[PDB]
Design a protein around this ligand. Sequence first.
Ligand code: MET
Ligand SMILES: [Mg+2]
Ligand SMILES: [Mg+2]
Ligand SMILES: [Mg+2]
Ligand SMILES: [Mg+2]
Ligand SMILES: [Mg+2]
Ligand SMILES: [Mg+2]
Ligand SMILES: [Mg+2]
Lengths: 130, 124
Amino acid sequence: GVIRLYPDERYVFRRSNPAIVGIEVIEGRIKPGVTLIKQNGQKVGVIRSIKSRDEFLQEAKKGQAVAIAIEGAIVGRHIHPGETLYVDLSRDDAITLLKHLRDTLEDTDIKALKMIAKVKAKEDPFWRAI
Amino acid sequence: KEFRYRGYTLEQLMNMSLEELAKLLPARQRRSLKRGLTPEQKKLLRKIRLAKKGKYNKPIRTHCRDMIVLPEMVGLTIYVHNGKEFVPVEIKPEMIGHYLGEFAPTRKRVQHGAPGIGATRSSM
RNA sequence: UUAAUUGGAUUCAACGCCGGGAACCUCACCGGGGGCGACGGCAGGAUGAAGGCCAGGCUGAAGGUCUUGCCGGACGCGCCGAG
RNA sequence: AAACCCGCCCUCAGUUCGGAUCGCGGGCUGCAACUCGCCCGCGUGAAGCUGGAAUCCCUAGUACCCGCGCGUCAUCAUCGCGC
RNA sequence: AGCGGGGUGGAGCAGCCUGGUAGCUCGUCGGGCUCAUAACCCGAAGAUCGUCGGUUCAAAUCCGGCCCCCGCUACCA
Ligand code: MET
Ligand SMILES: [Mg+2]
Ligand SMILES: [Mg+2]
Ligand SMILES: [Mg+2]
Ligand SMILES: [Mg+2]
Ligand SMILES: [Mg+2]
Ligand SMILES: [Mg+2]
Ligand SMILES: [Mg+2]
């Protein structure tokens, strides 16, 4: 999953403990309890809860806006508005997706995974060779 | 911008006896010429003159690294042994008075690698 | 490092030591070219072995080899042992 | 033989200290001096202003300072052995 | 978002106040000592003080806007 923070001040509803901010999905699927990382890989924390409205949600698909309440992330030093966030991926999970679960893969998922591999191709040559 | 060796053009150098020319070279070359040429240098000079006459249209390869360049040798190409191969030399007018071996290096230029074990007191 | 930068010696008791101040030689290294098998025997050999040369090519230079023909007369590495 | 002695110039300065490095020219040995020899004339003028922790030799015609002979050797001694 | 602290060799700290040298410890490279290695002793390299400007005879110091992180509470989709 890859998302981008709104450059809008309105979506920010709480700064720290927890960080509550709206989000639109660019690619992939957001799930609770998934770690998010930046290009440099700082641990912004683990998504604690997601809510499209006052109601409690479970997951968000493509073209859906949702306010995320996350832990360990602070606006400014840890996260900036209008900055693009990436879901941290496990190489074993990537191998399983590319080999075992190749039936349940679509355009947005493959685009997200490919660009995530391109971005993560910085330290381990495994993502460089994809 | 023309070539002159002691105030003499190339043509004036061509029409000179060996004894006359030796008065213009440095002391070492004058002494070497005054003692005459070795037989190998005689054969090499014969081949050079034959080539100048228009015969012997073949590469000129030699072992005589101590031959002195003469004005009549200008314009040819000579292959001088350097220890393992014959390297080509194209004679220019400003080469008059030098040994052939001066134009055929015998050692390869040095590019140092990383110092090995035993290069310092603490590496032993 | 290099085609080669020949090799021995590593505390006192290796390092102006090998009497080692190497232009050739020394020389043992690198590139290239030539030469050598007493003595036994096997093919061969006066109808001439083994060997040597005027000139000219190949060649760094060379009867080393080839071209071109002139020599000399009894041994013979083309082959096996041996030195 | 030199260190040594007498007279004149320089007077504490990278200099009239130091002479490495390089240019041009003249010579000797040798079959051959470019790689790779030694000598001479003019020119040029680098680092160096007394040396950290460590460490060597020496008890009398000895140590320090100064030159010379022989060996090696066609030419070449900042070396060895002697004076 | 608002309040509050601080930027100094490869690393970790002093040095401000009271201007006028950039010092400490560790690490890196080289040398001594020992039969040899560790311990130990010496030397060298490495920052011209986060940026701009002002102040001052002269600023690592006095001062600012400016780059960054740090501290705090506020902030419930
Ligand atoms: C909060 O009220 C809710 N709007 C969160 C989603 S933001 C698109
Ligand atoms: Mg000697
Ligand atoms: Mg010598
Ligand atoms: Mg030799
Ligand atoms: Mg002087
Ligand atoms: Mg020379
Ligand atoms: Mg002085
Ligand atoms: Mg030690």
